[PDB]
């Protein structure tokens, strides 16, 4: 087509979605991790994670307001990844990289799994 | 902080939100324009438009599944702007610029109003 494109549009949309999350506006699901609860928007979770995409396209699970993650999932690793979903920023540190990579593999967040693998390989 | 950032994350999120819109997945509102109906996600509409942000933060309107726009709004102008919300791409043409600018002013989409004003000024 002959469209023009606003470079900062996608980043501005994500920034606003994160502002809605902060203020708990139109959040429609609670993700439960080892008795730690995280409110979010189903559509953002689906847009970021192969696991949530599969969960919320299921005819029965699409209607659930609570999703319980596998007990092996670390709440801090989940929190770091939820922050990444809404900001594009990943708080990757020596002390959390193993939990973050394990959580990203479970959530099916391929680009995160990739940078964790590379950061681990650099330290060996 | 000491975060790393994935450059393409925001664009990838928006691309996936548009794929959900195409497949009518988790759309939670119908926008009615001169008897033309458009399904969308409230959160994306709020992230893009000052008008929808005001509508869906209202304690009564946040719960509506149908929103009727002012009868002066042109369905094609709305369609072009809805496409822009989900893609960052604006199909601005000599034949639609007046309707697009009028719709963007009503929806409170300041960056669109700005490029329409500039494109109109160049033709005078």
């Amino acid at each position: 087509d002959s469209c023009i494109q606003f470079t900062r549009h996608a980043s501005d949309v994500l920034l606003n979605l994160n502002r809605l999350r902060s203020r708990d506006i139109l959040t429609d699901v609670v993700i439960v991790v080892s008795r730690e609860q995280f409110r979010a928007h189903k559509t953002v979770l689906m847009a970021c994670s192969g696991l949530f995409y599969s969960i919320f396209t299921d005819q029965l699970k699409c209607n659930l307001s609570v999703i319980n993650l596998d007990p092996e999932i670390n709440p801090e690793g989940f929190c770091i990844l939820l922050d990444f979903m809404y900001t594009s920023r990943l708080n990757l540190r020596e002390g959390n990289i193993m939990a973050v990579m394990a959580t990203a593999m479970y959530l099916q967040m391929e680009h995160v799994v990739d940078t964790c693998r590379k950061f681990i390989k650099a330290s060996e | 902080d000491s975060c790393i950032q994935f450059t393409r994350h925001a664009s990838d999120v928006l691309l996936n939100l548009n794929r959900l819109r195409s497949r009518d997945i988790l759309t939670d509102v119908v926008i009615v324009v001169s008897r033309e109906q458009f399904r969308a996600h409230k959160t994306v509409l709020m992230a893009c438009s000052g008008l929808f942000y005001s509508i869906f933060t209202d304690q009564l309107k946040c719960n509506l599944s149908v929103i009727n726009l002012d009868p002066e709004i042109n369905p094609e102008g709305f369609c072009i702007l809805l496409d822009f919300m989900y893609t960052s791409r604006l199909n601005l043409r000599e034949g639609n610029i007046m309707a697009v600018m009028a719709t963007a002013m009503y929806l409170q989409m300041e960056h669109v109003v700005d490029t329409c004003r500039k494109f109109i000024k160049a033709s005078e």
Binding site: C3, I4, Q5, F6, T7 | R89, L90, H111, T115
Partner: peptide, 4 residues
């Protein structure tokens, strides 16, 4: 704004 740019030409994509």
């Amino acid at each position: 704004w740019v030409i994509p």
